[PDB]
Amino acid sequence: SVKSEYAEAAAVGQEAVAVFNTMKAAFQNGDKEAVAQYLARLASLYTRHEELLNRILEKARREGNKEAVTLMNEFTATFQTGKSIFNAMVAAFKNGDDDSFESYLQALEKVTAKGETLADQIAKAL
Ligand SMILES: OCc1cc(-c2ccccc2)on1
16 A cells, blocks of 8 residues: 555665764764765665655555655655755765765754654655
């Protein structure tokens, strides 16, 4: 069901949380090579999370599950913020700008954290 599909999406999001915090440890240790690889992994995970989220929202719409559609619109809006800041983070890494990278790393955390009470609400609506 859409619910199992959201569980699969939730797991992929958690995988990105795991890799992100392991990437944040590398960065603070100055292990740039590991960071470069982790950032490639994270993008691949976020891109796959986005795809499971879009399919879930489209399916909620085809089902007419108005509340789930509302919440998923709100979720996908927060999700595009993460994308924007994530792409700037990667750009700061490319540029060698550690000050901007640190800042973007903190932003994503508050973007991910804030967007979590919604994520649990979607589970319960689908
Ligand atoms: O905070 C959620 C989030 C989403 C993304 C993202 C990154 C790159 C492409 C698409 C999405 O990064 N963080």
